[PDB]
Amino acid sequence: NGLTVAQNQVLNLIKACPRPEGLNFQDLKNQLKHMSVSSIKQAVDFLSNEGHIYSTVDDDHFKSTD
User: Fold this and answer.
1) Euclidean distance between CA atoms 62 and 33, whole angstroms
2) Taking a C-beta distance cutoff of 8 angstroms, is the pair 44, 53 a contact?
3) Which of 47, 46, 25 is nearest to 36 (CA)?
4) Which residues partner with 54 through β-bridges?
5) Which residues form the signal peptide?
6) Which residues of 39-51 are buried (b: 16+ CB within 10 A; e: fewer)?
């Protein structure tokens, strides 16, 4: 899909979560234990800007764009 392994790791987790509130940054850290905070943030920022994910009504959680 053009995304890097890191970007896909983050996107796949967000996609795989059907909960209405989505995943927060702590959830990402907890599930991507081999990825640094900076690397996760880098991937999230990219996915957000590209439009693959968005921040929910709650200012700190992430969901996949349908």
Assistant:
1) 18
2) yes
3) 25
4) 63
5) none
6) ebeebbebbeeee
Nearest to 32 by CA among 53, 1, 65, 7: 7
Class of the 1-66 domain? mainly alpha
Stated as kind and residue range, the H or E segment containing 25 is: helix 25-31
Under 8 Å between Cβ of 28 and 40: yes
Q: How many CA atoms lie within 13 A of 9 on its CB side?
A: 17
Q: Which residues lie across from 64 on neighbouring strands?
A: 53
Instruction: Give me the resolution in angstroms, 1 decimal.
Output: 1.4
Query: What is the experimental method?
Result: X-ray
SS3 category, 54: strand
